[PDB]
Design a protein around this ligand. Structure first.
Ligand SMILES: CCCCCCCCCCCCCCCCCC(=O)OC[C@H](COP(=O)(O)OCCN)OC(=O)CCCCCCCCCCCCCCCCC
Ligand SMILES: CCCCCCCCCCCCCCCCCC(=O)OC[C@H](COP(=O)(O)OCCN)OC(=O)CCCCCCCCCCCCCCCCC
Ligand SMILES: CCCCCCCCCCCCCCCCCC(=O)OC[C@H](COP(=O)(O)OCCN)OC(=O)CCCCCCCCCCCCCCCCC
Ligand SMILES: CCCCCCCCCCCCCCCCCC(=O)OC[C@H](COP(=O)(O)OCCN)OC(=O)CCCCCCCCCCCCCCCCC
Ligand SMILES: CCCCCCCCCCCCCCCCCC(=O)OC[C@H](COP(=O)(O)OCCN)OC(=O)CCCCCCCCCCCCCCCCC
Ligand SMILES: CCCCCCCCCCCC(=O)OC[C@H](COP(=O)(O)OCC[N+](C)(C)C)OC(=O)CCCCCCCCCCC
Ligand SMILES: CCCCCCCCCCCC(=O)OC[C@H](COP(=O)(O)OCC[N+](C)(C)C)OC(=O)CCCCCCCCCCC
Ligand SMILES: CCCCCCCCCCCC(=O)OC[C@H](COP(=O)(O)OCC[N+](C)(C)C)OC(=O)CCCCCCCCCCC
Ligand SMILES: CCCCCCCCCCC[C@H](O)CC(=O)SCCNC(=O)CCNC(=O)[C@H](O)C(C)(C)COP(=O)(O)O
Lengths: 45, 80, 69, 257, 65, 53, 77, 132, 88, 64, 105
């Protein structure tokens, strides 16, 4: 059968290893970097 | 701002200020107060702002002077 | 764990996770010694150090060349 | 000489941090592998060790605002800033390595933090972080890998700062032309190729990985097997100099001694 | 403050090298880290004086050649 | 300890210290990058000289 | 006493051979090529540097009597 | 493929020493049982006369590619760089200086650079500013 | 804590999933430690090579070709990995 | 060091310290050999540094 | 030696040939979903010659087979850390146990 281990390598693309979860927040706190900056933006005014 | 190169220091003045050898040019006078600012200001980026931009504006004029002294040199290459 | 034959192998560093029974007793015995040594270095260091740019004033050097000229 | 000394101090922090964090990735995994091909999808499991590498990697890539920018870019700026033939050639060698720095840095992080898992599943249910003693130095170096380059720039790279301990002959003071005569394109070119090249590689690694199986194109297989063996210099040194050098000693031992 | 910045790691290096068997393992790692820590502090003190206050130090121990 | 066969790896729940400690360091980097870029981006790329204000 | 070294038979033949290579050495045309290089090529090779430059190198405080840096810049244009 | 290290003889005639073709012990299988496991040598195995250049302590022998193949590729790598450098130098494609080199007053700091008399001057002077 | 060593109870569980997940095992073929990879499980000669390759990949080890030709029952695989330093 | 020779005393002892540290696990063959490779190539550099120091004494008379 | 088809000795040789056939392809392809395809492709290539009882074609195919594994060999093979050739090999090997033998020297 094509890919005989379809029932063994499934977790390599499911759950925490899904495409979204892997890249989920790969940039640590990017919006938090904006978040404090956004405070400083209107504090600058 | 610094719209033109300030008064050139005399050689006797440069010796007493321990000026670096390569920074002895038309912009030497503006460098002298800046160094005193750095010592008490601990060379910090935020302390010596007015003098540093005053000094660095002088050097651009020196760079622009050399460009004005290149085509003057380059014209003579077109003499023959 | 296992046996590493530390019975006769007695290097200066012990070897194979060696910790003596009276390790607390000797621990301060070295801190007392080590701290004294550093104090010695600070006493020796400040007594003998000097600034090589201040030993000779500028006037004295400005005449040395006139002698060797 | 002032530029090199300043970049030496900066590099002692965003390269020491890389090793410690990498030394924590190897420690965190219970199989204690070191090959990056047995990693994958570690970002969620060890996010602190990832964050130290990511900040170090951006600093190593001279992203503006970080310590790498205040030291690495200006050196490359001045390769074109000398306006000599030799200076121009090395500028491209620097510019390739400026981009390559942005290319293998992404490769290292992607292969170990943004890739599908390769290690046995038993490892992940035991893949955790380390103790506080191993963490304290990395945080201290992490801060110095962001702010330290900005605070220490004017001491070394300042205009007219008295640093006579390093001599710069008056005819060799080209710092003025470097910071004024460079077009705008050069000031961003290492970043534009660095950011563009990294993302282009990042897409190819993720959605189009079929290209990077180099065993098809024999030219690309020979090329890969060439740089992977480090320009064969290890093979040329061992087999042809040490092996030859030892043979001279054998000739003297046999035909003379 | 100069002689402390230079030879302190040497003192820490020797303590674990020869007295290490007598001071265990954990108590031997932290003494070595202690010796380096002294040198880190002493360097910044020198850095404050040297770079900013333009003071230089020199401790001449004895002749060699 | 036991090993339940044929189960995917669930989304990990690391200790709350590590996630906050990681993001804060990353947040500072982005905050510092944006804070500097708001004050020196023309100077970085040469659009405006430092002494133009 | 107690024979602490587990003597290996083939090690002895190795050491016995390595201490008696001179017995089996024969002065063929190849040993004559290596003898010439190591005893008449190299020694004469350094026999010329050691004499073509002996008493010809007054380096103690050899001053500079020549300018280093260019004075007039000619652009390629 | 798996060539022996260079400078290894084919025929040696050392009296009654046993004749055995050299075998590089570095390439032996680590998985097999060996008495000298670190050196991968069974007890009492005969040794080649030049066995010092074949056992583990000898320099590591890289047998991935032919040596002449390595010289071909390694030389090929710098041939491209020499090509890239040589092409530029021929036509002068590298940029020209945008301004005159940095100038200085006082005859270009001749005296400040250890020029005793006006005779030396150019022996020590840097670039001299002609707009004094 | 780290991995609490590697006892045969955990060893046998990891081998079972490899056999459970392989669809080339003939339907049925109840997997017990005493079952042989040829008769009880119905794995062909080339299938047994793949099974051990996954077995050695699951424990991050490298079984030599000389010794991997001798593992023929599931209890042999359980017994082998137990007495191994590099088992994790 | 305030003279080039004291620099050489430190310069050599980076290699001696590294040789021990790189070959720290002296039971690992790839690591015992790696220490020797790191020690010897540096000595090749140190061989030339000694020669340079000599020409400093020849030309100038001191290494301060 | 003499390649005897279907013999046990030939079973091991194919077992060795297939063991290196997947490991080498595993090193070049480090994504599992792409690696599974390559194993099937090679397994779809060990079936073409599965039923061949002619020794004359067996040597030539076996000569070719090693050349393919030798051509596509990975210069930097993946090794487990504690296995020989890895990174932890012979790291802090426990000392050999043997009673001390005193001597009067
Ligand atoms: C360090 C002590 C803070 C310096 C004193 C406060 C100050 O003068 O400015 C705060 C300083 C901003 O520095 P910066 O943005 O680079 O330039 C000045 C902007 N008007 O803030 C900083 O430079 C950041 C200091 C690192 C934390
Ligand atoms: C077992 C080893 C046997 C060693 C035998 C030789 C030991 C030294 C020989 C006797 C020295 C006696 C002595 O210390 O005299 C005091 C001397 C004062 O001489 P003075 O010229 O006035 O100092 C100014 C110099 N710039 O003071 C000095 O000159 C000492 C200056 C030395 C400063 C650098 C010391 C190097 C660090 C050594 C660390 C190891 C020793 C530990 C010492 C404990 C204190 C830390
Ligand atoms: C040391 C000072 C310079 C001595 C140069 C010696 C060069 C030399 O003698 O090369 C000979 C050697 C190969 O000679 P050989 O072993 O006799 O070849 C037999 C092949 N069947 O060739 C070599 O061993 C390579 C030596 C290269 C020297 C550069
Ligand atoms: C391995 C087993 C252990 C045994 C060996 C251990 C290592 C040996 C350590 C000591 C070495 C012996 C040298 C010490 C004897 C003192 C030498 C001396 O005479 O100093 C001369 C110095 C200046 O000479 P002068 O003005 O003529 O006055 C002397 C007239 N009697 O007169 C003075 O003012 C005396 C100055 C004394 C200085 C203290 C000695 C410092 C020694 C440690 C530092 C060594 C140098 C630094 C090297 C460290 C690495 C960089
Ligand atoms: C240049 C002229 C050639 C100078 C060569 C000196 C003559 C021969 C001396 C070498 C004697 C052999 C030796 O020192 O022992 C063998 C040792 C093995 O090292 P290795 O096997 O590579 O370590 C691998 C660890 N996994 O090998 C070594 O570690 C020796 C380390 C190298 C010694 C200097 C090599 C020359 C460096 C200059 C090369 C210039 C190229 C540009
Ligand atoms: C500026 C110059 C400063 C010089 C002073 C440096 C102080 C450090 C001395 C510590 C010695 C030590 O530790 O040696 C003793 C230790 C003991 O074994 P272990 O490693 O603890 O493991 C123990 C387990 N065994 C028994 C399996 C090894 O090592 C050894 O026998 C290793 C052999 C190499 C020692 C090399 C010493 C080199 C000294 C310096 C050479 C110039
Ligand atoms: C361990 C091994 C020990 C080896 C010892 C080596 C000693 C050095 C040998 C130097 C030889 C040398 O200098 O040879 C050259 C001499 C000089 O004559 P020339 O060459 O014509 O001079 C050229 C003069 N111009 C150039 C000015 C015209 O020639 C001889 O008469 C060699 C005699 C010595 C060997 C008998
Ligand atoms: C090794 C191969 C490296 C690449 C090939 C270089 C070819 C080339 O053209 O290199 C030529 C270069 C440049 O010298 P130039 O052109 O005189 O510099 C112009 C003189 N300025 C700078 C004063 C205006 O010099 C070299 O070789 C340098 C050594 C190379 C590394 C050894
Ligand atoms: C990435 C690299 C790409 C390139 C990678 C390398 C791939 C190499 C090429 C792939 C095919 C190549 O023909 C290899 C070959 O022929 S080998 C099969 C030999 N077959 C025989 O000689 C007949 C005897 N056959 C049997 O005895 C049974 O079929 C069996 C072997 C299953 C015993 O098992 P059990 O007793 O049932």
């Amino acid at each position: 059968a094509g890919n005989p281990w379809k029932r063994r390598d499934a977790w390599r693309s499911q759950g925490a290893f899904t495409r979204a979860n892997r890249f989920r927040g790969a940039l640590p706190g990017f919006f938090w970097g904006l978040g404090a900056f956004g405070v400083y933006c209107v504090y600058e005014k | 701002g610094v719209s033109e190169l300030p008064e050139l220091l005399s050689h006797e003045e440069m010796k007493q200020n321990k000026i670096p050898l390569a920074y002895r040019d038309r912009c030497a006078r503006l460098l002298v107060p800046l160094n005193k600012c750095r010592k008490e200001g601990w060379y910090m980026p935020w302390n010596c702002v007015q003098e540093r931009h005053d000094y660095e504006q002088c050097q651009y004029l020196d760079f622009k002077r050399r460009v004005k002294e290149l085509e003057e040199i380059k014209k003579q290459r077109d003499a023959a | 764990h296992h046996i590493h034959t530390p019975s006769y192998i007695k290097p200066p560093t012990g070897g194979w996770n060696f910790t003596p029974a009276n390790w607390k007793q000797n621990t301060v015995l070295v801190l007392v010694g080590f701290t004294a040594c550093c104090v010695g270095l600070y006493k020796l260091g400040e007594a003998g150090s000097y600034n090589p740019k201040l030993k000779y004033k500028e006037e004295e050097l400005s005449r040395w060349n006139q002698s060797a000229k | 000489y002032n530029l090199a000394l300043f970049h030496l101090i900066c590099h002692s922090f965003f390269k020491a941090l890389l090793f410690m964090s990498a030394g924590s990735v190897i420690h965190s995994i219970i199989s204690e592998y070191q090959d990056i091909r047995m990693y994958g999808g570690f970002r969620q499991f060890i996010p602190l060790a990832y964050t130290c590498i990511f900040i170090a990697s951006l600093s190593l890539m001279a992203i503006p605002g970080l310590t790498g920018f205040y030291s690495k870019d200006i050196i490359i700026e001045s390769m074109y800033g000398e306006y000599t033939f030799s200076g121009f050639i090395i500028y491209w060698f620097a510019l390739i390595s400026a981009t390559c720095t942005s290319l293998y840095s992404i490769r290292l992080i992607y292969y170990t933090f943004l890739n599908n898992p390769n290690s046995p599943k038993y490892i992940y249910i035991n893949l955790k972080e380390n103790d506080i003693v191993l963490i304290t130095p990395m945080i201290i170096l992490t801060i110095l890998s962001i702010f330290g380059g900005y605070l220490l720039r004017d001491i070394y790279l300042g205009m007219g700062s008295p640093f006579n301990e390093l001599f710069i002959h008056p005819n060799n003071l080209s710092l003025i032309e470097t910071e004024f005569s460079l077009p705008s394109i050069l000031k961003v070119l290492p970043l534009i190729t660095g950011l563009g090249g990294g993302l282009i590689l990042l897409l190819i690694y993720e959605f189009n990985y079929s290209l990077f199986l180099v065993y098809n194109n024999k030219n690309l297989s020979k090329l890969y097997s060439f740089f992977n063996q480090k320009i064969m210099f290890d093979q040329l040194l061992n087999n042809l100099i040490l092996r030859s050098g030892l043979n001279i000693g054998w000739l003297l031992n046999v035909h003379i001694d | 403050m100069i002689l402390l910045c230079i030879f302190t790691p040497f003192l820490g290096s020797l303590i674990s090298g020869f007295f290490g068997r007598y001071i265990g393992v954990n108590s031997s790692k932290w003494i070595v880290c202690l010796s380096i820590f002294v040198s880190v502090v002493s360097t910044y003190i020198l850095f404050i004086d040297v770079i900013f206050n333009e003071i230089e130090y020199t401790y001449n121990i004895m002749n060699w050649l | 300890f036991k090993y339940v066969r044929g189960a995917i790896v669930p989304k990990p729940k690391v200790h709350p210290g590590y996630v906050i400690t990681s993001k804060f360091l990353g947040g500072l980097m982005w905050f510092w990058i944006f804070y500097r870029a708001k004050q020196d981006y023309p100077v970085w790329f040469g659009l405006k000289h430092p002494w133009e204000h | 006493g107690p024979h602490l070294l587990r003597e290996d038979a083939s090690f002895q033949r190795y050491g016995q051979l390595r201490d008696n290579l001179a017995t089996y050495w024969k002065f063929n045309r190849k040993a004559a090529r290596n003898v010439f290089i190591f005893l008449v090529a190299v020694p004469a090779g350094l026999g010329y540097l050691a004499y073509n430059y002996e008493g010809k190198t007054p380096f103690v405080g050899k001053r500079r009597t020549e300018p280093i840096f260019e004075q007039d810049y000619v652009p390629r244009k | 493929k798996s060539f022996l290290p260079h400078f290894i003889p084919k025929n040696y005639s050392y009296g009654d020493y046993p004749r055995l073709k050299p075998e590089n012990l570095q390439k032996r299988d680590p998985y097999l049982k060996y008495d000298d496991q670190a050196n991968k040598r069974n007890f009492n195995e005969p040794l080649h006369p030049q066995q010092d250049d074949l056992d583990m302590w000898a320099p590591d022998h890289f047998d991935f590619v032919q040596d002449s193949i390595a010289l071909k590729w390694f030389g090929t790598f710098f041939g491209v760089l020499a090509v890239f450098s040589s092409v530029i130098y021929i036509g002068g494609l590298y940029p020209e200086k945008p301004a005159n080199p940095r100038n200085y007053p006082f005859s270009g700091l001749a005296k400040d650079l250890g020029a005793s008399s006006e005779e030396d001057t150019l022996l020590y002077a840097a670039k001299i500013d002609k707009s004094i | 804590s780290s991995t609490p060593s590697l006892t045969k109870e955990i060893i046998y569980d990891r081998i079972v999933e490899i056999l459970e997940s392989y669809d080339n095992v003939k339907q049925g073929s109840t997997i017990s430690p005493a079952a042989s990879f040829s008769k009880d499980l119905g794995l062909d000669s080339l299938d047994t090579v793949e099974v051990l390759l996954e077995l050695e990949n699951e424990f991050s080890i490298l079984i030599p070709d000389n010794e991997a030709d001798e593992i023929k029952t599931v209890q042999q695989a359980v017994d082998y990995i137990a007495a191994q330093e590099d088992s994790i | 060091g305030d003279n080039y020779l004291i620099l050489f005393v430190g310069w050599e002892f980076i290699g001696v310290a590294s040789y021990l540290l790189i070959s720290f696990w002296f039971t690992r063959f790839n690591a015992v050999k790696s220490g020797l490779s790191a020690l010897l190539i540096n000595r090749f550099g140190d061989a030339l540094l000694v020669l340079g120091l000599s020409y400093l004494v020849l030309v100038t008379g001191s290494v301060n | 030696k003499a390649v005897v088809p279907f013999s046990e000795a030939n079973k091991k040789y194919v077992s060795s040939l297939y063991r290196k056939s997947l490991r080498t392809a595993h090193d070049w392809i480090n994504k599992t979903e792409f690696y599974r395809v390559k194993a099937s492709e090679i397994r779809s290539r060990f079936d073409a010659n599965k039923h061949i009882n002619d020794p004359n074609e067996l040597k030539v195919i076996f000569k070719e087979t090693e050349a393919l594994l030798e051509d596509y060999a990975h210069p930097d093979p993946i090794i487990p850390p504690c296995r020989p050739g890895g990174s932890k090999f012979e790291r802090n090997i426990p000392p050999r146990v043997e009673a001390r033998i005193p001597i009067d020297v």
